[PDB]
Amino acid sequence: TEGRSRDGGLRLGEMERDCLIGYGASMLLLERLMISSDAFEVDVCGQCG
Amino acid sequence: DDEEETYRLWKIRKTIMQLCHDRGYLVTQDELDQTLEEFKAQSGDKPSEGRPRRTDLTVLVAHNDDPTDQMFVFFPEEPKVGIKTIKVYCQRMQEENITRALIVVQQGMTPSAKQSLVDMAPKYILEQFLQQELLINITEHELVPEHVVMTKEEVTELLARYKLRENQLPRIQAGDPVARYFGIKRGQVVKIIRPSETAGRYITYRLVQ
Amino acid sequence: KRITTPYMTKYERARVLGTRALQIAMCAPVMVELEGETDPLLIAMKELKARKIPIIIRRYLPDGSYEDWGVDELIITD
Amino acid sequence: ADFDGDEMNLHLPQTEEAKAEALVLMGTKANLVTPRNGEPLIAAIQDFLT
Amino acid sequence: TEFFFHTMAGREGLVDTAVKTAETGYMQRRLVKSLEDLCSQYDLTVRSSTGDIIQFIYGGDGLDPAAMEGKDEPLEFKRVLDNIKAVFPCPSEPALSKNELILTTESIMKKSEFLCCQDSFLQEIKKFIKGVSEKIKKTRDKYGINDNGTTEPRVLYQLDRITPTQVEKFLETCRDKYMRAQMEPGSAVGALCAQSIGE
RNA sequence: ACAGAG
DNA sequence: TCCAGCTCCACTTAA
DNA sequence: TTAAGTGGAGCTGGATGCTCTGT
Ligand SMILES: [Zn+2]
């Protein structure tokens, strides 16, 4: 959620993303922007895609 | 004028000699060092001097590959050259069995003539130069590095040293002034020698495409 | 012969310590004698300095060939 | 930063692999010099120079 | 009236700061999207994601901007030799002459580990050592020093002193600092370029 | 949708 | 509020 | 005389910084 009233949390913006790329920090960028936000699993059919 | 007009016909001719020398045509030491006050002797001022057919060059044979591989340079007098004048130069070129020519136009070329040079023949290739480009030898300009057209046996080492394909090299256009100057075609590679800030050099490569 | 640089890069060092810390966090054998350290990343740094880490770094050239370098035979540096 | 009611963000990496990449690559001791011209940015400031 | 004009000149700095956010943040976003794919490869090349080449060697040297001890150059030889003289002064060793310095330098520089350097860097060291060797001659000519070490007021050998141990430690420090200053494979070199022009 | 803060 | 592509229409060459 | 390739002019659609803190 969006902010302090809603106990929202903080944003890793498009600019913070550019910082972490320049460090070569590939796993931290995966942890921050996938694992600690919105990790999910989908069933994908390999035949029709 | 007349002082200024002869100056162009000397500088243009001087650059064409260096252009033909850099392409590897047989050029003599007295052609490259032809001085202004020496130019005045074979052809003088404008009434005696003739532009369309006196300053033409055909002595240029490709002395490396073969003395039968030969090239013209032509200096039209009409500022916009029509297909008629092209057909005139083409049939003269057909008679001599020469396959390359340079046409040095004074102001431009009409669109239907430009289209002809693409399709007249792959075995009869003609290159448009504007004289305003030839008044300054761009290979001696301070921003232009040394370009060196690579041999197939050296391209095969470049691609072996880095394990590349040809289509991963950087590109250079055929419409580039320095590509036109050396007359290179699609699939040739140019070595480029960039100067360092130090005494050293950096070597880079480009593909014509 | 192996043509690539003998020095361990900071990216190789970061990921070896990371993967070894994750393996020491799970119940893997520790190759050094630990001395009351609890933090897995601190134990992995002792194993790197002692050259005991059992990881091979497969350097990849862009054409698809590879070089297998041992972590113990790269020159480590700060 | 200038300590005039400034706010800053904090993130806690939730993974052992994310600790190591943060510590080795993004640590302050590994980043004393800016990438740009190679000049030090973590150094003394007012009342430490005076 | 003076206060009003000073307030006019002041607001143009306030208004520049209020504009500078929108004036620059869009510029940096464009730079990053263009440059972010560029990575320095293990074969010392810079390639895009599709595998085309942007550069055959990064920056012409292969060297890392963050490691430059000089103005865009990896070392500063005057500083490095002074450091080695002061950390390792060798009072029990002779001071080398012009010819003995050149001879001992080319004995060390032909060892196998120096072959891994770029030839431009080996020339700069030899150019520097030749420069140092000429200062020794000029001083020893002025003061009448004899290269055999026999001259009685021994303080003269302090003037341009250099010892074999200091030459050996100098060449190792230079060669090490060059190898550690190379742009390491994997480096996200486009993102550093983007931010270094944007900031 | 507006005001703030850095 | 500023700026690249796309399309319509006069303007010479050429047969 | 006109078929056609290319100049110049107007129309159209895109874009314009990062966050929390409240009503
Ligand atoms: Zn399916």
From Swiss-Prot, chain A:
What does the protein in this record do?
Catalytic core component of RNA polymerase III (Pol III), a DNA-dependent RNA polymerase which synthesizes small non-coding RNAs using the four ribonucleoside triphosphates as substrates. Synthesizes 5S rRNA, snRNAs, tRNAs and miRNAs from at least 500 distinct genomic loci. Pol III-mediated transcription cycle proceeds through transcription initiation, transcription elongation and transcription termination stages. During transcription initiation, Pol III is recruited to DNA promoters type I, II or III with the help of general transcription factors and other specific initiation factors.
Residues annotated as binding Zn(2+):
45, 48
**Taxonomy, superkingdom:** Eukaryota
**What protein is this chain from?**
DNA-directed RNA polymerase III subunit RPC2
The UniProt similarity line reads: Belongs to the RNA polymerase beta chain family.
Annotated source species: Homo sapiens (Human)
**Where is this protein found?**
Nucleus; Cytoplasm, Cytosol
Q: Which residues bind DNA template strand?
A: 4-5, 11
Swiss-Prot record, chain B:
- What's this protein's function? DNA-dependent RNA polymerase catalyzes the transcription of DNA into RNA using the four ribonucleoside triphosphates as substrates. Common component of RNA polymerases I, II and III which synthesize ribosomal RNA precursors, mRNA precursors and many functional non-coding RNAs, and small RNAs, such as 5S rRNA and tRNAs, respectively. Pol II is the central component of the basal RNA polymerase II transcription machinery. Pols are composed of mobile elements that move relative to each other.
Q: Does the keyword Transcription apply?
A: yes
- What is this protein called in UniProt? DNA-directed RNA polymerases I, II, and III subunit RPABC1
Xref: Pfam families: RNA_pol_Rpb5_C (PF01191), RNA_pol_Rpb5_N (PF03871)
What are the subcellular locations of this protein? Nucleus; Nucleus, Nucleolus
The alphabetized list of GO BP terms reads: protein stabilization; transcription by RNA polymerase II; transcription elongation by RNA polymerase I; tRNA transcription by RNA polymerase III
Q: What is its main location?
A: nucleus
Q: Where is this cross-link: Glycyl lysine isopeptide (Lys-Gly) (interchain with G-Cter in SUMO2)?
A: 80
HAMAP family under this entry? RNApol_Rpo5_RPB5
Spell out the Gene3D superfamilies in the cross-references.
RNA polymerase, Rpb5, N-terminal domain, RPB5-like RNA polymerase subunit
Query: Which species does this protein come from?
Result: Homo sapiens (Human)
GO cellular component, alphabetical, reads: cytosol; nucleoplasm; nucleus; RNA polymerase I complex; RNA polymerase II, core complex; RNA polymerase III complex; RPAP3/R2TP/prefoldin-like complex
**Family statement:** Belongs to the archaeal Rpo5/eukaryotic RPB5 RNA polymerase subunit family.
Q: Which GO terms describe its molecular function?
A: DNA binding; DNA-directed RNA polymerase activity
PROSITE patterns referenced in this protein's UniProt entry, alphabetically? RNA_POL_H_23KD (PS01110)
Phylogenetic lineage: Eukaryota, Metazoa, Chordata, Craniata, Vertebrata
Swiss-Prot record, chain C:
> Source species, please?
Homo sapiens
Q: Which gene encodes it?
A: POLR2F
Q: Record's Gene Ontology CC terms? A: cytosol; fibrillar center; nucleoplasm; nucleus; RNA polymerase I complex; RNA polymerase II, core complex; RNA polymerase III complex
Q: What does this protein do?
A: DNA-dependent RNA polymerase catalyzes the transcription of DNA into RNA using the four ribonucleoside triphosphates as substrates. Common component of RNA polymerases I, II, and III which synthesize ribosomal RNA precursors, mRNA precursors and many functional non-coding RNAs, and small RNAs, such as 5S rRNA and tRNAs, respectively. Pol II is the central component of the basal RNA polymerase II transcription machinery. Pols are composed of mobile elements that move relative to each other.
Family to which this protein belongs:
Belongs to the archaeal Rpo6/eukaryotic RPB6 RNA polymerase subunit family.
Traced from the root, the source organism's taxonomic lineage reads: Eukaryota, Metazoa, Chordata, Craniata, Vertebrata
Nucleus as UniProt keyword: yes
Residue window of the full protein shown:
50 to 127 of 127
Question: Is Ribonucleoprotein set as a keyword in this record?
Answer: no
Transmembrane feature ranges = none
Question: What processes does the entry annotate via GO biological process terms?
Answer: transcription by RNA polymerase I; transcription by RNA polymerase II; tRNA transcription by RNA polymerase III
Q: What is this protein called?
A: DNA-directed RNA polymerases I, II, and III subunit RPABC2
Q: Which UniProt keywords apply?
A: Acetylation, DNA-directed RNA polymerase, Nucleus, Phosphoprotein, Transcription
State one molecular function term (GO).
DNA binding
The entry's localization annotation reads: Nucleus; Nucleus, Nucleolus
Curated annotation (Swiss-Prot), chain D:
The residues that the entry says bind Mg(2+) 2 are: 2, 4
The entry's note on the tissues where this protein occurs is: Expressed in the brain, in the cortex and the white matter (at protein level).
Give the superkingdom in one word: Eukaryota
Q: Which residues bind RNA?
A: 6
Q: Tell me where it resides.
A: Nucleus; Cytoplasm, Cytosol
Binding-site positions, Mg(2+) 1: 2, 4, 6
Per the UniProt record, the associated disease is: Leukodystrophy, hypomyelinating, 7, with or without oligodontia and/or hypogonadotropic hypogonadism: An autosomal recessive neurodegenerative disorder characterized by childhood onset of progressive motor decline manifest as spasticity, ataxia, tremor, and cerebellar signs, as well as mild cognitive regression. Other features may include hypodontia or oligodontia and hypogonadotropic hypogonadism. There is considerable inter- and intrafamilial variability.
Q: Give the protein family.
A: Belongs to the RNA polymerase beta' chain family.
Q: What does this protein do?
A: Catalytic core component of RNA polymerase III (Pol III), a DNA-dependent RNA polymerase which synthesizes small non-coding RNAs using the four ribonucleoside triphosphates as substrates. Synthesizes 5S rRNA, snRNAs, tRNAs and miRNAs from at least 500 distinct genomic loci. Pol III-mediated transcription cycle proceeds through transcription initiation, transcription elongation and transcription termination stages. During transcription initiation, Pol III is recruited to DNA promoters type I, II or III with the help of general transcription factors and other specific initiation factors.
Which source organism? Homo sapiens
Encoding gene (name): POLR3A
